[PDB]
Design a protein around this ligand. Structure first.
Ligand SMILES: NC(=O)c1ccc[n+]([C@@H]2O[C@H](COP(=O)([O-])OP(=O)(O)OC[C@H]3O[C@@H](n4cnc5c(N)ncnc54)[C@H](O)[C@@H]3O)[C@@H](O)[C@H]2O)c1
Ligand SMILES: NC(=O)c1ccc[n+]([C@@H]2O[C@H](COP(=O)([O-])OP(=O)(O)OC[C@H]3O[C@@H](n4cnc5c(N)ncnc54)[C@H](O)[C@@H]3O)[C@@H](O)[C@H]2O)c1
Ligand SMILES: NC(=O)c1ccc[n+]([C@@H]2O[C@H](COP(=O)([O-])OP(=O)(O)OC[C@H]3O[C@@H](n4cnc5c(N)ncnc54)[C@H](O)[C@@H]3O)[C@@H](O)[C@H]2O)c1
Ligand SMILES: NC(=O)c1ccc[n+]([C@@H]2O[C@H](COP(=O)([O-])OP(=O)(O)OC[C@H]3O[C@@H](n4cnc5c(N)ncnc54)[C@H](O)[C@@H]3O)[C@@H](O)[C@H]2O)c1
Ligand SMILES: Cc1cc(-c2cccc(C(=O)c3ccc(F)c(O)c3)n2)ccc1O
Ligand SMILES: Cc1cc(-c2cccc(C(=O)c3ccc(F)c(O)c3)n2)ccc1O
Ligand SMILES: Cc1cc(-c2cccc(C(=O)c3ccc(F)c(O)c3)n2)ccc1O
Ligand SMILES: Cc1cc(-c2cccc(C(=O)c3ccc(F)c(O)c3)n2)ccc1O
Ligand code: NA
Ligand code: NA
Ligand code: NA
Ligand code: NA
Lengths: 256, 256, 256, 256
């Protein structure tokens, strides 16, 4: 591919799921990709699979891991053009009274501060390349979700942070955007469904939450990411919905 | 009541449903209310019922009716403080290929231009009173609805128009806001449900579209309207959602 | 290009400005493009310029023009995959009291019903191709604009209509999305600025309304359109903002 | 007043600014109000001033303070109907590279987790009263702000959390809403302006960010809060904008 040839991209949580779909999309567009992940299994195999992708073990909640991620990226490839903050986690459904402040803080540490930390360490290099930041948020940050108060809050923060940072970095020509996926079929979706009383039914309800009648694919998030990086030069601070239309119209969720 | 004492309010489509609930709320707040409606039956009885409400027959799609509505309001009460553009219609569910351009134009004539015309004729008097405009839009203008392309489009236009007019009239201290109700139990809802194969089931689905598990009441829209008129002095161009939370979260509406 | 090879695209108002930028983007992606415009000058030259683009004279407010546009497209190219409803107009700045209902109706005829009519005539063919609709709306439909009540209202309607139609056509795999550009430097922008007391200053204010410090280009809208057509297969009913961040943060627009 | 007579309201950060305006509004509506604040000076004087208001020293970042706030409220007044999470802080303008993860965590501790903690401890009592939660967020959570990445992120989280909790508590008839104020003239605004090179100019720019040409007042936020508590019985999960129209239209913030 030539759409993003000669560019260098870091993707966190790139070892599986949406992150791996994003990794593949950027490789297909001609970019060199650093795969960052806290687990080795998926990311290491993906490095072997994809010419132009390399794997760096890095836990985004550990600032020294992230500092080394950036320095190794520059040392090995000489520039940095795009950072995709995809690493994140959705806890199992929890009622509000079943949540804790410390569990909330830990989820904020991954979903929000890890995104914050990599972005901050990368920005000096992005400014030199007039690169861009892509945060992976969630539709539920905008519309809410049941039994997920901490998760929804972290994603509301990421989407808002994307806009604030877009304002700050616009004078330097660094664009900052986010993608808000809806139901994307990933290993995380599969794992969460398996915890449920009826996994197959939970999966069917998840497919039917979209007017398109299916869940999305990691490759479709990946294509949205490559668009924001390579072709959306007048887009900054936007929230790109990749949701199959889940937010549209009425659904199941006289005046007394 | 004293919240809006000494003020004069015009409510279109005030003879039944949401409009009548709005009429009652303003009367309860101490205002004098002109009830405008194209049908006499509901509005005339409401005038007899409510001290401080009077009924003026007026079809908002007829500019001469609307001109007389405003002039009679000033002649009889000496001022005009608030205009509530509530008159509107929801056609029966229609597939896109079952719609027509001329049916679309007629619906725009009622839901949009009738609101436009009364607002324009009222604004010279609202400027003198530092009054305000309240348009009744719909949640489906913001999130869409199935089998209602013309209706949804008219309400998208009303909500947008509310913001444009708010900008234009802010130098004169005239506020312009809208209410976007979701499912409100009114004679219109009842009539539309009766057209359906299973009316009782359509009504149950309508109640369940809200997390609160019920439809809203005209009185609840009325309270929102009295708030915008009497107490929201720093609110202009807002869309006040009165929807029971229908827009929140996933509902019924693997990656292949 | 190969991103949209073998596909057939109709672009209305394709003779200049954003429409011509969209035409060029689809030609660059390998598509055959029918340029529709009410004026011959730009579109005819563009047909001569671009192999794979042809010009069909068509006023989208004339249903017989639009019927012939679709039938000629099928007759000459054998399929139809994407319709881009770009034709539209922004009147000069007008205060609300300077507007008329009939001027409002005429603007609705172009900006809204022309989009409605082509979409309706095209949908049987889009369903056969699992094609898609792209409406060009405006950021001011979502946030309002001063001295543009009719224009803002037409664009609020287009954005809302996009969501309603997305719901209706999702069972058939036809996606329906819109692009909301902000300030894009086009012949229309230039013409409107020339009417102003100080054109150069109006143009400078227009550049500064964006955090990126410039207006957008038609080519950038074109790239967004090609993305929605060719790569956003899980996107339907979305509003893709192409605005340079104009909607972000505070600007120029103690408590007494 | 009688609008909220016999009800018991807790307002955090109630000692000055928006919180004190909210306290006064609920007292004026007939409610008994517990003023919570980490500083004694404002809240203690307000207790002496207002019959029906009492002051409880409580730092919302200290879970034992908050536990005692709730238990003392029940012990002294026998019920709890409304919690207004107003306590929060806006740091001085900081460039992204001038922020720290630990400063971010501390701001999240106040603006987000303090709101989370009081809400969680209050909900068993709100469920018994079918009471409601009102979170004070900010417009900049939705539209972003320059030099305020941590602040904007905390408010994006609060707004999103409001919707998630609304979903969770709707089965119990507990409504959860938020107010997003724009520029409100408070001691915090005054203090931040005084740090600036030109305070008077910063204040003038702040007034002009609104189409209404002024900042808002705490009393106007207070009226919005009393509406959500006492009269918005079909509103849950909404974001009530109290911004003077700052989010509307273009402002200061050719295609190259
Ligand atoms: N799957 C969906 O439906 C969905 C929807 C909306 C948003 N999202 C978001 O998309 C992102 C990816 O989700 P997914 O479904 O692909 O998840 P996933 O669990 O399948 O994969 C996430 C990857 O990130 C890695 N990761 C987790 N914590 C990490 C850390 N501390 N440091 C580095 N890597 C770490 C994991 O090891 C894994 O490889 C998340 O931010 C999630 O919130 C997912
Ligand atoms: N009912 C809902 O669930 C719902 C939801 C969202 C928005 N709305 C909007 O609320 C408004 C009122 O709806 P409703 O359900 O109360 O409807 P309704 O049919 O019960 O009452 C509407 C009233 O307006 C009058 N009216 C209609 N056309 C008129 C005209 N040309 N001139 C003057 N009066 C006219 C009718 O005679 C009637 O009295 C409409 O704008 C509607 O789109 C309704
Ligand atoms: N320029 C901007 O800043 C801007 C911003 C947001 C949205 N938009 C929208 O983008 C679209 C294009 O705007 P532009 O600035 O390129 O305008 P433009 O005036 O430069 O070009 C519009 C083209 O459409 C054609 N057209 C007009 N009426 C037509 C009709 N009845 N039938 C067929 N063709 C017709 C014109 O002849 C012209 O070739 C419009 O819908 C406009 O509202 C523009
Ligand atoms: N002023 C504005 O323009 C503005 C705009 C939007 C949102 N807001 C929000 O409104 C709220 C109030 O802002 P304000 O301008 O009135 O601020 P303020 O500084 O004038 O008053 C805030 C009050 O909260 C108290 N407080 C702070 N930390 C506390 C803690 N840990 N525990 C208990 N009380 C604590 C302070 O002592 C003070 O009395 C905040 O959440 C703020 O983010 C303000
Ligand atoms: C019944 C319920 C289900 C989930 C759930 C189940 C599987 C996967 C996910 C998930 O990872 C997800 C799904 C949609 C999103 F927009 C998103 O950001 C993440 N969630 C969560 C909460 C629930 O109350
Ligand atoms: C199955 C279906 C139902 C309706 C329907 C049925 C009864 C009443 C209404 C209605 O008057 C309404 C309902 C909600 C709104 F936000 C609104 O502005 C109006 N609508 C419409 C379309 C449908 O595809
Ligand atoms: C001072 C003022 C200016 C304009 C104006 C001037 C030049 C071009 C345009 C325009 O065509 C446009 C600009 C932005 C949009 F989002 C859009 O859909 C169209 N508008 C309009 C109104 C005004 O009160
Ligand atoms: C030049 C600049 C100014 C501020 C600033 C100055 C005074 C007060 C505030 C404030 O407390 C505030 C203002 C608006 C809000 F919507 C809000 O939630 C809080 N802010 C902040 C950042 C800046 O880059
Ligand atoms: Na490799
Ligand atoms: Na009477
Ligand atoms: Na050609
Ligand atoms: Na007292």
């Amino acid at each position: 591919g030539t759409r993003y040839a000669g560019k260098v991209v870091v993707v966190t949580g790139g070892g599986r799921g949406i992150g791996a779909g994003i990794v593949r999309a950027f490789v297909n567009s001609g970019a060199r990709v650093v795969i960052c992940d806290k687990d080795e299994s998926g990311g290491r195999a993906l490095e072997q699979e994809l010419p132009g992708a390399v794997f760096i073990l890095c836990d985004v909640t550990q600032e020294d891991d992230v500092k080394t991620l950036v320095s190794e990226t520059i040392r090995r490839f000489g520039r940095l053009d795009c950072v995709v903050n995809n690493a994140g986690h959705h806890p199992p459904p929890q009622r509000p009274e079943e949540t804790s402040a410390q569990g909330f803080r830990q989820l904020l540490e991954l979903n929000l501060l890890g995104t914050y930390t990599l972005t901050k360490l990368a920005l000096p290099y992005l400014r030199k390349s007039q690169g861009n930041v892509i945060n992976i948020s969630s539709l539920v940050g905008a519309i809410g979700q049941a039994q997920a108060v901490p998760y929804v809050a972290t994603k509301g923060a990421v989407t808002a942070m994307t806009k604030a940072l877009a304002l700050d970095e616009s004078p330097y020509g660094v664009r900052v955007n986010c993608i808000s996926p809806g139901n994307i079929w990933t290993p995380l979706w599969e794992e969460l469904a398996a915890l449920m009383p009826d996994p197959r039914a939970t999966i069917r309800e998840g497919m039917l939450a979209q007017p398109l009648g299916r869940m999305g694919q990691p490759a479709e998030v990946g294509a949205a990411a490559v668009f924001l990086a390579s072709e959306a030069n007048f887009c900054t601070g936007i929230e790109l919905l990749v949701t199959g239309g889940a937010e549209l119209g009425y659904g199941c969720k006289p005046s007394g």
